[PDB]
Amino acid sequence: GPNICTTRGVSSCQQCLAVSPMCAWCSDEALPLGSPRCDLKENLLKDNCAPESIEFPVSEARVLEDRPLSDKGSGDSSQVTQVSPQRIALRLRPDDSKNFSIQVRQVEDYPVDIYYLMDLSYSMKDDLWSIQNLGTKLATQMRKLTSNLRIGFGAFVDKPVSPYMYISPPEALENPCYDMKTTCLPMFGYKHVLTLTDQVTRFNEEVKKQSVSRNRDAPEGGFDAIMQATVCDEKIGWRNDASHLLVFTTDAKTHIALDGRLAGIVQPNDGQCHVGSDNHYSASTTMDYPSLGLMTEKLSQKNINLIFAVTENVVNLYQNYSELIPGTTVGVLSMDSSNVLQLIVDAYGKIRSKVELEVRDLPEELSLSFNATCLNNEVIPGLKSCMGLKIGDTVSFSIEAKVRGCPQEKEKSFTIKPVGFKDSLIVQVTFDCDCACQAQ
Amino acid sequence: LNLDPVQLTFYAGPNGSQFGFSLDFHKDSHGRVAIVVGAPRTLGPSQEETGGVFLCPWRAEGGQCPSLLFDLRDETRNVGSQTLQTFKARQGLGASVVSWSDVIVACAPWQHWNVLEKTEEAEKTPVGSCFLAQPESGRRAEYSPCRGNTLSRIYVENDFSWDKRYCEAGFSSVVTQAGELVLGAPGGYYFLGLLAQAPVADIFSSYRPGILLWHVSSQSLSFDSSNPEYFDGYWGYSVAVGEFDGDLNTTEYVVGAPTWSWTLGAVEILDSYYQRLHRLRAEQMASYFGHSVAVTDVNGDGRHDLLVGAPLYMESRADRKLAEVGRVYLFLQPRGPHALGAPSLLLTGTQLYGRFGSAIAPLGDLDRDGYNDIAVAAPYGGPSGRGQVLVFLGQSEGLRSRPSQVLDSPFPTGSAFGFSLRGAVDIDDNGYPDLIVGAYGANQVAVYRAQP
Ligand SMILES: *[C@@H]1O[C@H](CO)[C@@H](O[C@@H]2O[C@H](CO)[C@@H](O[C@H]3O[C@H](CO)[C@@H](O)[C@H](O[C@@H]4O[C@H](CO)[C@@H](O)[C@H](O)[C@@H]4O)[C@@H]3O)[C@H](O)[C@H]2NC(C)=O)[C@H](O)[C@H]1NC(C)=O
Ligand SMILES: *[C@@H]1O[C@H](CO)[C@@H](O)[C@H](O)[C@H]1NC(C)=O
Ligand SMILES: *[C@@H]1O[C@H](CO)[C@@H](O)[C@H](O)[C@H]1NC(C)=O
Ligand SMILES: C[As](C)(=O)[O-]
Ligand SMILES: [Ca+2]
Ligand SMILES: [Ca+2]
Ligand SMILES: [Ca+2]
Ligand SMILES: [Ca+2]
Ligand SMILES: [Ca+2]
Ligand SMILES: [Ca+2]
Ligand SMILES: [Mg+2]
């Protein structure tokens, strides 16, 4: 009966609205000059008010632009839409709260980075075609799975130190193959040749200009290269937001930590970057090979997926090392690239992204709340983040905006967009305070 | 029993020389006790890393020690049509030291060698070499069983048969009680690994100053193999001697091959004729099972037991993950003509990357309770990762699964505290065995005394 709108009714229509969202008004003179001017809607009807002079605003928030979420990307990705309602006009009265909806879908292709590691030792001579073809076929397979790629590559042989490296006669330093009446490049530990880039055709030309070197012992320093390609952030060019694939090749055994003592090297591997301006692993001759453990730690620390593309004569060996380093796959390198390519396909299919909403520029006198509904369709209030979604999957959120009074900013706007996305929901806020010109 | 970690003595060498990389007790032709210390990066008067040996007399104060003089300059000799030449640059003299009653033996695993004949050579390669010294008489002798005079081309046609060009002889070493020197050449036979031995007396007597390639008549080397399991095994990366076949008239060898059978690692017991007696394979690839190998009777039964270090062992932690901590393996000798079965005990490290098992030294009977004890190094162990040596006591069923004493490193980081260890000798002469610990990274050697 007596209600909170009446207990405080004072003198203006505006002031009546500033009391509560549920209060109405009535500028109809046909009412006794002592009856409730400010009261509920039903109460004003019983008091015989003309539904024409009543001023009872309501919050609505209408959907302006909202083209559905797309279902492709191959052909031309102009500007695609993966967010729901890109722009809505939210108009609300003092202290009221209006709720709206928004839903996203992962439509863009996952960013993928592949770094090829070429074993360029002499035993690789008869395999050179295979690793060049693979390196070329690599860029192709991924480009077909994701229009967003950054490929690159580097090479290794072993530690340029006796007894691995031939140190006589003097011609052998520049041409290790000298003794065989043939000619090859001088030895080197690890060399970074091509930084990660989107220029696929330039990657292919560069990979095909590669030739072998020579070393004395079958085991090589591939692990020195895996370590360096992993811990040299800026040099390699890994892009933090993307999936990192590290394909490694070899046709022989490998040097593990503690092997370096044959070269007089005893300092345990520090696990840090040592590839300077010259693009060479400078510690190669002074630091020992890394142990399996240090590798694993670093691979995880940098979120790099190690893949072994090795010849069949050494496959079992790398499978066994694969078990000692979890999360690493092994493929058999050869003229036929089906096998090792599958590993790249799989790695992609295992990628998961996440929708985490963020709020940019929202008035201080305004506050939000969310009711998320992920994959399992289980609604959880307060939360505004969903995980484990593949490509195409859709996730929705329920948003509620609340104000404190009636701001002198009469026109403002804010944005709600998930991180890792460009598509955002822009909300135009309008505060309806004043009445329809009601006077008495 | 308890080794005092406060009134400990310190010995030191030049900066960067890696003083303490190797060490041994020297009981001279006289009677006092000294410490032979190897420093493989010690500069020569030519200002190039040739290595060096130091002979430290006992003194609670410690400090500097006299240098044990050795020929540090390159040799070149012409024999007929060949020019024989030895290169000492970065040869690492003292990368392995070992004293046997009267004489000291230091080795340069990385000393290079070459032979020239017209327009063909044999190659310049690390055959390695050992320098023998008798400090009293000031005498010297040399032993380099791997130097050859076969030209490069011949090996290519033989398909690299009996190729001792990269031996790295003296990489590791031991002298039996009877005076036979046993050298470990992990690079031998094109990286298979080999072992060479000869009687110290014969090495001295057959040596002639000026001759660079000679055959010590009473010598014998291991063999080359075509069995893939031995390829790149490094058989000889470490060695030890002991009694394992029951016949006390014959001594047997214990060899470490840390990379045997595709990095699976292994250790072997052989007689003096290199005939195989047994083989302990490892349990994890890349663990470096064979890195260290100790021999002693830990349970008082009168028969030698075997200790094997695998410093790189990755332990199975909860949640499908692994952790590199290192591990030691105990093998007790079952009596008579019987095979050494599975490991009687698995001591395994705790600190990550500490490389537990990196070194194992048989102490004597610390507590005198009638059971021999041992000390295990973990050069990068401890909360700080500054390294720490753990003492394990002799029980009746083997050894105590718990370390009775934990000696921490008094040196800074990278000291490699523990990399080398030697015990079972009464240095202070108080009827109790002591322990010396090398920390090449700090260029020092710490001495721990046994006290009542
Ligand atoms: C990759 O890892 C696999 C998994 O370990 C390796 O395969 C195993 O290799 C074993 C040899 O190292 C091989 O033999 C052992 O197990 C056999 C089981 O049937 C068994 O026949 C053997 O028994 C005897 O062992 C004694 C030694 O105490 C010998 O004296 C005898 O002659 C017998 O060999 C062995 O216990 C095992 O069968 C095999 N298992 C699998 C999963 O295939 C593989 O070699 C590794 N590859 C490499 C080189 O990297
Ligand atoms: C807004 O919330 C009300 C109740 O709080 C509910 O009835 C309505 O379905 C919501 N509208 C939207 C945005 O779907
Ligand atoms: C969120 O859900 C709770 C209870 O499920 C409800 O009270 C609240 O009004 C909802 N708000 C939004 C943002 O829809
Ligand atoms: C070690 As090679 C024979 O591949 O240079
Ligand atoms: Ca090949
Ligand atoms: Ca090699
Ligand atoms: Ca015997
Ligand atoms: Ca025993
Ligand atoms: Ca004891
Ligand atoms: Ca003593
Ligand atoms: Mg090769």
UniProtKB/Swiss-Prot annotation, chain A:
Glycans are attached at N99, N320, N371. Keywords: Calcium, Cell adhesion, Cell junction, Cell membrane, Cell projection, Disease variant, Disulfide bond, EGF-like domain, Glycoprotein, Host cell receptor for virus entry, Host-virus interaction, Integrin, Magnesium, Membrane, Metal-binding, Phosphoprotein, Postsynaptic cell membrane, Receptor, Repeat, Signal, Synapse, Transmembrane, Transmembrane helix. This is Integrin beta-3. It comes from Homo sapiens. Ca(2+) 2 binds at D158, N215, D217, P219, E220, D251. Residues 109-351 form the VWFA domain. The constitutive activation of ITGAV:ITGB3 on neoplastic cells may contribute to tumor growth and metastatic potential. Ca(2+) 1 binds at S123, D126, D127, D251, M335. Phosphorylated on tyrosine residues in response to thrombin-induced platelet aggregation. Probably involved in outside-in signaling. Changing M124V: In GT2; may confer constitutive activity to the alpha-IIb/(mutated)beta-3 receptor.
From Swiss-Prot, chain B:
Isoform 1 and isoform 2 are expressed in platelets and megakaryocytes, but not in reticulocytes. Not detected in Jurkat, nor in U937 cell lines. Isoform 3 is expressed in prostate adenocarcinoma, as well as in several erythroleukemia, prostate adenocarcinoma and melanoma cell lines, including PC-3, DU-145, HEL, WM983A, WM983B and WM35. Not detected in platelets, nor in normal prostate (at protein level). Changing Y143H: In GT1; abolishes the binding function of alpha-IIb/beta-3 for soluble ligands without disturbing alpha-IIb/beta-3 expression; functional defect is likely caused by its allosteric effect rather than by a defect in the ligand-binding site itself. Ca(2+) 2 binds at D297, N299, D301, R303, D305. Changing I374T: In GT1; expression of mutant subunit alpha-IIb/bet-3 is 11% of control; mutant pro-alpha-IIb subunit is retained in the endoplasmic reticulum. Ca(2+) 3 binds at D365, D367, D369, Y371, D373. Ca(2+) 1 binds at E243, D245, D247, T250, E252. Its main location: membrane. It is found in: Membrane. Integrin alpha-IIb/beta-3 is a receptor for fibronectin, fibrinogen, plasminogen, prothrombin, thrombospondin and vitronectin. It recognizes the sequence R-G-D in a wide array of ligands. It recognizes the sequence H-H-L-G-G-G-A-K-Q-A-G-D-V in fibrinogen gamma chain. Following activation integrin alpha-IIb/beta-3 brings about platelet/platelet interaction through binding of soluble fibrinogen. This step leads to rapid platelet aggregation which physically plugs ruptured endothelial cell surface. It is linked to Glanzmann thrombasthenia 1: A form of Glanzmann thrombasthenia, a disorder characterized by failure of platelet aggregation, absent or diminished clot retraction, and mucocutaneous bleeding of mild-to-moderate severity. Glanzmann thrombasthenia has been classified into clinical types I and II. In type I, platelets show absence of glycoprotein IIb-IIIa complexes at their surface and lack fibrinogen and clot retraction capability. Bleeding disorder, platelet-type, 16: An autosomal dominant form of congenital macrothrombocytopenia associated with platelet anisocytosis. It is a disorder of platelet production. Affected individuals may have no or only mildly increased bleeding tendency. In vitro studies show mild platelet functional abnormalities. Belongs to the integrin alpha chain family. This is Integrin alpha-IIb. The lineage of its organism: Eukaryota, Metazoa, Chordata, Craniata, Vertebrata. The chain holds residues 32 to 483 of 1039 of the full protein.
